[PDB]
């Protein structure tokens, strides 16, 4: 019954200059630990979340949005093509990766 990292799209096609969304959701925020996005597996860190939250009042959350770790790439360039993994870690000294999504490949059109 451990946490699952869900990347629903095996691939996304995007025109250069357009924006795209890489979807990732988790079934839980536990155990505490960041969610990070990598290109490749070698791999390149591109985005990171904590499971902490901003004060709720400054949001103008839901069960689903609290678990949505999707990222956007704006103004896509050919060098954005590749496979992107959403990865959940347990917090520690140091953190250890516990689960990875299945990868989403980004196809960039001219």
């Amino acid at each position: 019954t451990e946490v699952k990292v869900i990347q629903p799209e095996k691939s996304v096609s995007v025109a250069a200059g357009d924006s795209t969304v890489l979807n990732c959701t988790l079934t839980s925020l536990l155990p505490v630990g960041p969610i990070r996005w990598y290109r490749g597996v070698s791999r390149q860190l591109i985005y990171s979340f904590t499971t902490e939250h901003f004060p709720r009042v400054t949001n103008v959350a839901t069960k689903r949005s609290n678990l949505d770790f999707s990222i956007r790439i704006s103004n896509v360039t050919p060098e954005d093509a590749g496979t992107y993994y959403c990865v959940k870690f347990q917090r520690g000294s140091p953190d250890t990766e516990i689960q990875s999504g299945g990868g989403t490949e980004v196809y960039v059109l001219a």
């Binding site: 591109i46 985005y47 939250h53 959350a61 770790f69 999707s70």
Partner: peptide, 15 residues
């Protein structure tokens, strides 16, 4: 840079 989170519930950062 050109990377952002869809949701702003959890603090997040590129890199």
């Amino acid at each position: 840079x050109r990377y952002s989170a869809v949701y702003s519930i959890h603090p997040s950062w590129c890199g």
